[PDB]
Amino acid sequence: GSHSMRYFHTSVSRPGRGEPRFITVGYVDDTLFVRFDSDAASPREEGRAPWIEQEGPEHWDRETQICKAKAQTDREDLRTLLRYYNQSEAGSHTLQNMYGCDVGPDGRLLRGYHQDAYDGKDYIALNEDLSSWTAADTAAQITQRKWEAARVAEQLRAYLEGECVEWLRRYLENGKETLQRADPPKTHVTHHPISDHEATLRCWALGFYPAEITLTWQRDGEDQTQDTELVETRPAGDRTFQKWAAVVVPSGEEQRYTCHVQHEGLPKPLTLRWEP
């Protein structure tokens, strides 16, 4: 159905231990396809998916040059932020940036993104209009004024609506075998007596792609939103994901509970119960 491309970037200063470490990764949906690490033996944009390996040497030089120049601008920006926030030069700080686009099943632009964070907090973000900014505080407003004067939003809009969408379409076609295949979850319910008054019912989902999924428990057809323990969706390491949801049930009432599973790979939502 719908797809995304995203580039993530993190710079972490380490005063007294050299220059900041810079790591950037690119994803199409939940598939990593490129990485660059400034601490690597030979820092370069490295392919991580078979469908990107067909890109030529000119492509890799272009991406590598952009990563090296982004690592430099981030070092400069980390110094700038110390000034804007009146901070000491002694501490370690983090700069994060994420940009990219979402497209529908028809490959048309759904929305574009460009957002930055300092020390884990929102700093400045390009709004959905791709023409205005949301600054988190008076320091980000200084960057906003600079970015409005330089018409940065216009430059970003041209990339997000142009190259971002066209190259996302290109990668979806080149990688259609995997990027356009949904792997449905493999499901089961386990039962663990806790004592003689209560028991745990755990509903599992394994081997699915993409990561997006919904697992819920119902008791007599009513959602158990507050009483359900939901683990964060987690990577298996083979491209697929895993998730579980658990409920503590009064002994003898197990058949009153049903697990519900929604996933792109399923034509219809699944209903499971503890068997037997």
Partner: peptide, 9 residues
Amino acid sequence: LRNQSVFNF
């Protein structure tokens, strides 16, 4: 494909 544009804070 990355954005080639460079912007400073």
